[PDB]
């Protein structure tokens, strides 16, 4: 499976919406993608997985 989609430690995990909001979806183990709030400046023009069926597709 995809190797972007389990995200590390060390990042910058939980800006949220008024501080900003990039929504970025990320697999705990099982079967399940969880939501973190990066921050503009650390992803890159990219993007990292924005909803639950990319996330679950790509790693899941």
Same mark, same amino acid.
Request: with cysteine; charged share 30%; net charge negative.
């Given at each position: 499976?995809?190797?972007? $989609?389990? &995200?590390?430690?060390?990042?910058? *995990?939980? +800006?949220? %919406?008024? =501080? @900003? @909001?990039?929504?970025?979806?990320?697999?705990? /183990? &099982? /079967? @399940? $993608? *969880? !939501?973190?709030?990066? +921050?503009? =400046?650390?992803?890159? /023009?990219? *993007?990292?997985? %924005? !909803?639950?069926?990319? $996330?679950?597709?790509? $790693?899941?």
């Amino acid at each position: 499976y995809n190797r972007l $989609c389990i &995200k590390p430690r060390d990042w910058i *995990d939980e +800006c949220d %919406s008024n =501080e @900003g @909001g990039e929504r970025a979806y990320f697999r705990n /183990g &099982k /079967g @399940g $993608c *969880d !939501s973190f709030w990066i +921050c503009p =400046e650390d992803h890159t /023009g990219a *993007d990292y997985y %924005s !909803s639950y069926r990319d $996330c679950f597709n790509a $790693c899941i």
